Amino acid sequence: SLFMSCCGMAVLLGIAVLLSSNRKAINLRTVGGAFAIQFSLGAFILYVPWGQELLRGFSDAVSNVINYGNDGTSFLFGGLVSGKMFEVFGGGGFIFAFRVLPTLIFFSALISVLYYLGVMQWVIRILGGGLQKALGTSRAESMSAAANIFVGQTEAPLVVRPFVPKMTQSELFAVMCGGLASIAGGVLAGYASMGVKIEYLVAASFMAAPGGLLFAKLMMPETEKPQDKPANVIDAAAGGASAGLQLALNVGAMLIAFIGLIALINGMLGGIGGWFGMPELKLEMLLGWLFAPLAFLIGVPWNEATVAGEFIGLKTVANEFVAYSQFAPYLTEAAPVVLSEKTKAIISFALCGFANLSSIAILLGGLGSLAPKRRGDIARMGVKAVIAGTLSNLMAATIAGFFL
Amino acid sequence: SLFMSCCGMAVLLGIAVLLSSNRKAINLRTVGGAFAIQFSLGAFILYVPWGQELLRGFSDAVSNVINYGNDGTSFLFGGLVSGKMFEVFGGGGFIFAFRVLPTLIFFSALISVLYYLGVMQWVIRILGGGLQKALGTSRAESMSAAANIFVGQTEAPLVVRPFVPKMTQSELFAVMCGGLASIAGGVLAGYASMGVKIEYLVAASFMAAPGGLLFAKLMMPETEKPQDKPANVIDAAAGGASAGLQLALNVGAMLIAFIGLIALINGMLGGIGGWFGMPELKLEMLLGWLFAPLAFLIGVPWNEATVAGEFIGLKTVANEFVAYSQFAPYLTEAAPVVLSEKTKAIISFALCGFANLSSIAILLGGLGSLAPKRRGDIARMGVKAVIAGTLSNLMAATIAGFFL
Amino acid sequence: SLFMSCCGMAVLLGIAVLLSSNRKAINLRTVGGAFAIQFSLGAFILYVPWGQELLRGFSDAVSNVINYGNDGTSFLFGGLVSGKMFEVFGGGGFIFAFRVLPTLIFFSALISVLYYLGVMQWVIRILGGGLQKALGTSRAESMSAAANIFVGQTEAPLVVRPFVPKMTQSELFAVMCGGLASIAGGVLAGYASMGVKIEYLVAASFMAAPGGLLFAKLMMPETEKPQDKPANVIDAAAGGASAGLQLALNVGAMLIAFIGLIALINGMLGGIGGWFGMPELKLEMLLGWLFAPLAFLIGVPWNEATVAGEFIGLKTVANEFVAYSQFAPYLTEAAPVVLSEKTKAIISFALCGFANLSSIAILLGGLGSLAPKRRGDIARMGVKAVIAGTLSNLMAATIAGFFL
Ligand SMILES: CCCCCCCCCCO[C@@H]1O[C@H](CO)[C@@H](O[C@H]2O[C@H](CO)[C@@H](O)[C@H](O)[C@H]2O)[C@H](O)[C@H]1O
Ligand SMILES: CCCCCCCCCCO[C@@H]1O[C@H](CO)[C@@H](O[C@H]2O[C@H](CO)[C@@H](O)[C@H](O)[C@H]2O)[C@H](O)[C@H]1O
Ligand SMILES: CCCCCCCCCCO[C@@H]1O[C@H](CO)[C@@H](O[C@H]2O[C@H](CO)[C@@H](O)[C@H](O)[C@H]2O)[C@H](O)[C@H]1O
Numbered sequence A, B, C: 001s002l003f004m005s006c007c008g009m010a011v012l013l014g015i016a017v018l019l020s021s022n023r024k025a026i027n028l029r030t031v032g033g034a035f036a037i038q039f040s041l042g043a044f045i046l047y048v049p050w051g052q053e054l055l056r057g058f059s060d061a062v063s064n065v066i067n068y069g070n071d072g073t074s075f076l077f078g079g080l081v082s083g084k085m086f087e088v089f090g091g092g093g094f095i096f097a098f099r100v101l102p103t104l105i106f107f108s109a110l111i112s113v114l115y116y117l118g119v120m121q122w123v124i125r126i127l128g129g130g131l132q133k134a135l136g137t138s139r140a141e142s143m144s145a146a147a148n149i150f151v152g153q154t155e156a157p158l159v160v161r162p163f164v165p166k167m168t169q170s171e172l173f174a175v176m177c178g179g180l181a182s183i184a185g186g187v188l189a190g191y192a193s194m195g196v197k198i199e200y201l202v203a204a205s206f207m208a209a210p211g212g213l214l215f216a217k218l219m220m221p222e223t224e225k226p227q228d229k230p231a232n233v234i235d236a237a238a239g240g241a242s243a244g245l246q247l248a249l250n251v252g253a254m255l256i257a258f259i260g261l262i263a264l265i266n267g268m269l270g271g272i273g274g275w276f277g278m279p280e281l282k283l284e285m286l287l288g289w290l291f292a293p294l295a296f297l298i299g300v301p302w303n304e305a306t307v308a309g310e311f312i313g314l315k316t317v318a319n320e321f322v323a324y325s326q327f328a329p330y331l332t333e334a335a336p337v338v339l340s341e342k343t344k345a346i347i348s349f350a351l352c353g354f355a356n357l358s359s360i361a362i363l364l365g366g367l368g369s370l371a372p373k374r375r376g377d378i379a380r381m382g383v384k385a386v387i388a389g390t391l392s393n394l395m396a397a398t399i400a401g402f403f404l
């Protein structure tokens, strides 16, 4: 029952300790409090009545912003995003390119505006400040952790960019983990537009901040000593829109290519598998069979672990966007396999993160531009940081499944 | 009657003089002739029979080029831009992304071709030469003024780029005003494709050249002493297409974001306004209520000034493309408020310009790349240049409403 | 009969010799074997039973990869690329922007993956090695020739980039000719998706390698003495997708502009032609009338030479993508003029190449970045290289028509 979840949390903590750079340097206050905050934050908004109301209140607000932003894409694509599309194409009336991708543009513009006004910096300063005073983590790495709740892995360190070239290896590693453990506000609304429950996305986003620090300080404890704009609001919106556009195009091209490549792989796997009496062999089977124990460990029922392993595995070997794309049909009435509500929650939390191998190259570019003489350290800690970010997503999923 | 229009012209001239850097340095020949040309050009093509025939003749030619260019977008998007779209989606069958945006690509390619052949330089040399011999303005600032009739604010100074780093503050300010007072050939066909009368767009484009110089020399008189390629036509077209593409993507992303942001603002304004007994409070109401006296001053009837203020205000606080998008439904039979034909003309002329605050950042990049040591002067004169460009659009609207 | 084809081959060889930089320096082994290989390769896969089976076997494999890749674009555009589009828009249900362009993204990602795994380098090393041992051509120019069978003119020299800045003028010219005579794997599937027979595209791609070297060494014999990576496979796919995206956007913008410009030209040509009693005068008539002898020379029947000249001419004065776009309707049942199966083959082979004037500027950028001090030589040999690449396509067409 609930005992399998507590065992799951222990295993996840255990792996991090085994992969630590110095187990004797692990600050018990830091990693103890970081786990405590993530666990309590989960208990607050998923179990406690008042916390559930604040979560649904924030989520409904987010859901309202999405609809407002949809006026923009509705103007540009007209009837191609109207209700008439379902009367004609049925299920195929939902055009992903026009329904989901433009959201990345609107939310990038919005966040850019919220930065210009000082609203973003205000919230980050409060959250990031509360983390460092409770965990003993440094100022810069804590602000980046809090920033990662709302923005992406390359945008979050910008709030502390003059402190990045000289921050310690542990600090830099945590900054990397802050981004890998979390997502961004832009794609959050994208996944939400695909059918993923906003409550789960918002929750996993907030739990990423203490979770990211937790496994960063477990696997890479501090062994050193740390230290310590657009002309107007309309320009801010324009710059944000431009950034979101480029990003919308990149995601769209990636999805066309990756899904296409997966279709090619399955074709080959059918022929190769046929040589061993398994012509039905696909990539989903391999990933599901290999990640089933991992899915079972985080609280997924035995009879649903294999299907859950398909999505979690695909998120790891590729990215979370491709995973969500294959998981979204399981959230509709036309789902091939009806999953339990708890299993739907666990997958949503376990997928909610940028933790993948390809994110290392992205970290090298974005974070590396802030500190060009530190690209060596980033590439060195890349794989470990992905593992740490992965463990944070898995932990958040285990916690979510515990109180559900 | 016609007395309210002449008062409007006087007020617009008055504001420019009050905001001048030196009223005693204002050359009466320059500003007298510049206003005379703009006023006579208006009288010519909007009142005089022969001038109206030349205007409708040029406009029909422009309208033919658009249809020719539409063969390109029809090939690429097929039935999504056919008549069948209206039989299925009705009004929503008009997909803006495929109907309007591709025009920016075709016209950018065309203008690039017309530059390679020397056709553009020929027309500019004639118009720009006639301006300097009549106004006493310098060679470079006059050519840029004439160039701005056909191309954008960043492309126009390219015909005089080696003279830009060393031109006087008054010259540079005029070059800035030449672009802010005008639009570009690419978007002209875009606005035309949205329902805006081509005759008004062509007229306002030509009246921008003397109008831009007029308020540039009023607000910033000359107190100093002025001075004085693709391998083939197919490469020219390719480069122009590429530029138009990037530009089409930028405009599309901006519209999705800005319209989305406006929808968010209205949602908030409804809640905030509700605290003061005005739950129906929107951005259009604020802009309309605040720009109604300005609209009434340029010749809009009292009972139509508020609606006209919504579009003029939106053009100023954002850009003219967003304004035209909200004004285009008022040019159809399904218009929420039936406006007089004169009011439709005034709004079309008052909106026809790149005069907005966001254009300053664009001027800093484009025009600043031609003279990097002059970016300081550009940012300093930015706001004044926007005002000057705004006054030129308003003046052109007042004149247009006078002869109508 | 077959005598007209052999005369065609002789004329094509004759022109190259007349335009040679040194006829006395022409290596008879090189140009004799190069023609022999291209002729035998044609005889192998178009006439010989076993060769026809290997061709249809490879083509069916390519056709399977395309369908697999189409799962990506089907996910993104949903019902807009489904069969329902034909029930509603009929022929206009085929949306080029969503049917053809995304293929460029998937195949760029795939090729990028096949490079990371070492599969591409393996095949190139075998083919490129066989060429140099049989023709006596240098190592680097032979590998680039073999690489050009699968990738584009700017990507092919990358397999020998450290040898490019110091290769001889003849070597550099051959590298240029290798790209102009061939296409790329990405657009191959694009043209295939437009109705062009894959068998012809694959054949012309392979015949481009010896054909490119043939006319390179004829027109520019060697008079000097020659000499002699992404972190993971998922990053490779991502980078390839990104490159294909940018390329898909460029092609799309080019087609909108060029087709639009052609529509404008025809409008003007109708008015100009009307002055000489030819109001029906169009660009297709001019190109067809001017390229008819050339089409007749390569094996096109007298009563089909004019129509064939329209496409071949358009490919030369613009690019092969615009040509294929106007030729694709002639491959359907709704063709305005029913052409013989041999004529359809000849046009497909004669169009299958990047040989156009605009490709010189592309060569200056791509190939020039590998050797910035050699951009002078590239621009100097540009036109000659286009002619050489043109002759290779024409030769491949003559050969194809011979065995058909
Ligand atoms: C969707 C519509 C919603 C309604 C929104 C309307 C809000 C209007 C924005 C105006 O804000 C100002 O704009 C200036 C223009 O950029 C800025 O000046 C800046 O730039 C000037 C010149 O470029 C300089 O003179 C100034 O020093 C510098 O502050 C200035 O800071 C900024 O406060
Ligand atoms: C839609 C179809 C409509 C039909 C249009 C057909 C028109 C054909 C264009 C040819 O124009 C020439 O092309 C050359 C190729 O770039 C240029 O050479 C330029 O570049 C060469 C090499 O790159 C150099 O040798 C030359 O010196 C240099 O003039 C040359 O200037 C230019 O006049
Ligand atoms: C669509 C799904 C199909 C399933 C595909 C799954 C395949 C998984 C790819 C893993 O490959 C490895 O990834 C590492 C991560 O980049 C590379 O490390 C590289 O980068 C590391 C850190 O960034 C360094 O530590 C290493 O030295 C360096 O080899 C490494 O070379 C590469 O072999």
Ligand SMILES: Cc1cc2cn([C@@H]3O[C@H](CO)[C@@H](O)[C@H]3O)c(=O)nc2[nH]1
Pocket: A104, A151, A152, A153, A154, A184, A185, A186, A187, A247, A319, A320, A321, A353, A354, A355, A356, A358, A359, A362
């Ligand atoms: C708004 C935003 C979306 C985004 C996506 N990514 C990367 O793209 C993948 C797909 O979502 C992620 O795994 C990341 O590796 C990123 O690095 N920053 C982002 N900001």
Ligand SMILES: Cc1cc2cn([C@@H]3O[C@H](CO)[C@@H](O)[C@H]3O)c(=O)nc2[nH]1
Pocket: B104, B151, B152, B153, B154, B184, B185, B186, B187, B247, B319, B320, B321, B353, B354, B355, B356, B358, B359, B362
């Ligand atoms: C063809 C062309 C369209 C264009 C638009 N713009 C800017 O974008 C806004 C929207 O139209 C304008 O207000 C300008 O600030 C520009 O600077 N140059 C342009 N050329």
Ligand SMILES: Cc1cc2cn([C@@H]3O[C@H](CO)[C@@H](O)[C@H]3O)c(=O)nc2[nH]1
Pocket: C104, C151, C152, C153, C154, C184, C185, C186, C187, C247, C319, C320, C321, C353, C354, C355, C356, C358, C359, C362
């Ligand atoms: C995959 C790929 C398509 C491509 C097209 N082009 C150029 O674009 C034109 C249209 O196809 C060609 O004539 C070439 O001049 C290129 O240079 N490289 C390419 N790679």
Ligand code: NA
Pocket: A147, A148, A149, A150, A151, A152, A153, A156, A178, A179, A182, A183, A184
């Ligand atoms: Na983040």
Ligand code: NA
Pocket: B147, B148, B149, B150, B151, B152, B153, B156, B178, B179, B182, B183, B184
């Ligand atoms: Na202009």
Ligand code: NA
Pocket: C147, C148, C149, C150, C151, C152, C153, C156, C178, C179, C182, C183, C184
């Ligand atoms: Na090639």
